[PDB]
Design a protein around this ligand. Sequence first.
Ligand SMILES: C=CC1=C(C)/C(=C/c2[nH]c(/C=C3N=C(/C=C4\NC(=O)C(C)=C4C=C)C(C)=C\3CCC(=O)O)c(CCC(=O)O)c2C)NC1=O
Length: 209
Amino acid sequence: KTIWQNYIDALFETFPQLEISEVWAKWDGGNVGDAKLTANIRTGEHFLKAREAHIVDPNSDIYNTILYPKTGADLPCFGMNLMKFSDKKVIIVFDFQHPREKYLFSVDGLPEDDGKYRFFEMGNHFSKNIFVRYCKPDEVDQYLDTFKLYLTKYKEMIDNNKPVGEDTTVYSDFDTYMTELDPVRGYMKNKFGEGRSEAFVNDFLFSYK
Ligand SMILES: C=CC1=C(C)/C(=C/c2[nH]c(/C=C3N=C(/C=C4\NC(=O)C(C)=C4C=C)C(C)=C\3CCC(=O)O)c(CCC(=O)O)c2C)NC1=O
């Protein structure tokens, strides 16, 4: 079981076409294992891919998923990182992540946040509407309706533009940026080893570099 289940359900209710097209990894690790990784690639109409990583151990529950739309409509990706770190500490992040470097994207009517957060440069693959909240595991679903508004706006963008391009190099700047700045490598090395951490980051999470 996972505390992120209602986010995950909402995601695939909005985009029921996103079917698993490859289980990229199911790995065991952590203490003898207590940490499990599931890494799925999904495909479906209007998307290049959605890649979904879910890492669960006794204290942590991390759901990191990015939807990469087909190209040709200048659409942002939709990214979420739902991170339970301990039984006291959760960070919820989701946003429209635009592939063009240093382009400030926004959707009018959505919550706005111009604060600066760790690791990342705001305005550069994160939008005016980046949604970041810190709360306790049992509070996570209080932002679910907002997550669902983001999904609703995203689905309108997809359905109104109907992108059909498949130029994965549109996402190369984005994947490069997400690679240098995301704090993953360290956590996965410790839990799973070096080769697995490297491949997870470079060949699964951000593979369009
Ligand atoms: C898979 C394993 C995995 C690990 C181990 C991980 C760790 C991780 N991500 C973080 C932050 C963050 N991560 C993001 C955002 C994202 N990052 C993304 O990969 C995507 C897709 C988004 C958003 C759509 C942001 C904005 C922060 C900073 C949060 C903050 O400022 O505290 C932090 C810092 C938390 C803190 O400030 O205390 C850690 C430790 N992220 C992972 O994905």
